[PDB]
Structure 1
Amino acid sequence: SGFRKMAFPSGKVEGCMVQVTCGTTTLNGLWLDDVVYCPRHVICTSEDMLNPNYEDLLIRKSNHNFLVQAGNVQLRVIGHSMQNCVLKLKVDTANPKTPKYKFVRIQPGQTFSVLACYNGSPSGVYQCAMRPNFTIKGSFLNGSCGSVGFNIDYDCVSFCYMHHMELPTGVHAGTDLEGNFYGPFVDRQTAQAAGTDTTITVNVLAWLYAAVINGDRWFLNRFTTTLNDFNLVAMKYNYEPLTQDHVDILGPLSAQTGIAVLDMCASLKELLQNGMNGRTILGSALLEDEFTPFDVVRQCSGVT
């Protein structure tokens, strides 16, 4: 029993972290086979970041300008290219610790683990979600860029995030490993505001299932609702509209608990309308929305 915000074991990703330096800028790269992936803003001076022309900045950079270091051993760069907002540095050595891996572009509401690194060295691991506004709520200081977000399916690491940006509101923006930003964000120091941080309804419901499974049940009530009635309440409280797809995804948690998805919706409806009244659910005083239905099943069943 017990339910905790859990990250994937970071070992397979730790073995892929290197340091990349172009001139005076140091950040993290991801070393997979004979390619090191890193944010293209490694080629910028802070000056450049107001309105950088990356193609033009890149022309001034040669292979030998990209200093790549795995622990205390230097990698030889034999090629470099820009793909969207990332650089791919071809090195002469395949990373011997390359795990089985995929690159996946995740949907908003999907969760992943971040290995926060500085100078290619891991500092820690935490769980994130891609927010509906395509920000993530991270812990990233100067030097953390190139830190990656990932899921693990048994032995295969699916890399979904590379850290690039902090918005003036202290939320985080970045790319998939093909260098395409999540949402409308750009690697430029400009006016970029996050849109509404909407709550991931399907994740809250999953987490309410996790609570019932782990003995926290005070918020169960005698009510039910409909998708359309619940969605009137979702709208008011800036929650994602709940769809039949979301209902279908909650099926297995429904089955195991014997609580109909729409009855749990009626519990969430009452919690939205009445608050927690100073009570807690799985050690939280607000409605947690960074566990997926998959995350709840995984943790509640002890998958490895």
Structure 2
Amino acid sequence: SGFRKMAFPSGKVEGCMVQVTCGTTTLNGLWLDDVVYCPRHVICTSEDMLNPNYEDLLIRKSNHNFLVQAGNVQLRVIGHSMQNCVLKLKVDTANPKTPKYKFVRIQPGQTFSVLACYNGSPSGVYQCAMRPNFTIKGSFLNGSCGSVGFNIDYDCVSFCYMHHMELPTGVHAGTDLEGNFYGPFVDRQTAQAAGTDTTITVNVLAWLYAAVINGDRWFLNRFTTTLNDFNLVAMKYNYEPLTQDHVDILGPLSAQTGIAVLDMCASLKELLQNGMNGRTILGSALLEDEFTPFDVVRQCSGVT
């Protein structure tokens, strides 16, 4: 029993972290096979970030200008290319610690672990979700760029995020491992505001099921609702609309607990309208939305 904001074991990813320096800018790179992936803004100075022409800045850079260090040893760069907002540095040595991997582009509401790094060295690991406005609420300082987000299924690491920037509002933006930003963000220091940070309804319901499984049941009520009725309430509270796909995805948790999805929706509707009244659920005084239904099943079943 017990329910925690759990991150994937980071070992497979730590073995891929390297330091990339170009000129006076140092950030993190991801070394997989004989390629090192890093944010293309490694070629910029802080002045360049206001209005960078990446293609023009890249012309003044050669293979020997990209310094890649894995631990205390230098990697030889034998090629470089820009793919969207990432640079791919071909090195002469395949990473011997390369795990089985995939590059995936996640959808909002999906969760992943982040291995925060500085100078190619890991500092910490935490769990987060891709918000509905395509930002992440991470913990990143200057030098953290190139730190990655990932999921692990048994032995395969699915890389989904690479860190690029912090918006003036304190939230974070980045790309998938193909260099495409999540959302409308650009790697330019300009006025970029995030849209509404709505709550991931399907995740709140998943976490309510986790609470029931773990003994916190005070919020369970005598009511039911319909998807359309629940959705009117969800709209009022800036919660994402719940779809029949979401209901289907909650099926296994509904089967385990014996609590129909629409009954749990009615419990959630009451919590939204009446609040928690000074009470807590799984040690939180607010409705948690960074656990997917898959995460709840995984944590409550002990998948390694």
Report the number of matched residues. 304
- Given the two structures, how large is their TM-score scaled by the length of structure 1? 1.00
State the 1:8 CA deviation: 0.1
State the 1:202 CA deviation: 0.1
SS at match of 2:47: helix
Superposed CA offset, 1:263-282 (max 9, x none): 00000000000000000000
Q: Does 1:249 align with 2:273?
A: no
Which 5+ residue runs of structure 2 have no aligned equivalent? Answer: none
Q: Distance in 2 between matches of 1:3 and 1:18?
A: 33
Superposed CA offset, 1:37-79 (max 9, x none): 0000000011110110000000000000000000000000000
Q: CA RMSD in A?
A: 0.2
Superposed CA offset, 1:231-262 (max 9, x none): 00000000000000000000000000000000
Which 5+ residue runs of structure 1 have no aligned equivalent? Answer: none
SS at match of 1:165: strand
2:113: which partner in 1?
A: 113
SS at match of 1:46: coil
State the 1:288 CA deviation: 0.2
Q: Distance in 2 between matches of 1:45 and 1:5?
A: 36
Q: Which 4+ residue blocks in structure 1 deviate beyond 6 angstroms?
A: none
Q: Distance in 1 between matches of 2:161 and 2:275?
A: 34
State the 1:141 CA deviation: 0.2
State the 1:127 CA deviation: 0.2
Superposed CA offset, 1:8-58 (max 9, x none): 000000000000000111100000000000000000011110110000000
Q: Distance in 2 between matches of 1:197 and 1:90?
A: 38
1:23: which partner in 2?
A: 23
SS at match of 1:203: helix
State the 1:211 CA deviation: 0.1
Q: Distance in 2 between matches of 1:167 and 1:181?
A: 13
Superposed CA offset, 1:122-151 (max 9, x none): 000000100000000000000000000000
Equivalence map 1:153-168=2 (5 Å): 153-168=153-168
Q: Distance in 1 between matches of 2:36 and 2:26?
A: 14
Percent of residue pairs identical: 100
State the 1:7 CA deviation: 0.2
Q: Distance in 1 between matches of 2:119 and 2:271?
A: 44
Q: Distance in 1 between matches of 2:147 and 2:42?
A: 13
Superposed CA offset, 1:187-244 (max 9, x none): 0000000000000000000000000000000000000000000000000000000000
Q: Distance in 2 between matches of 1:136 and 1:128?
A: 7
Q: Distance in 2 between matches of 1:12 and 1:76?
A: 23
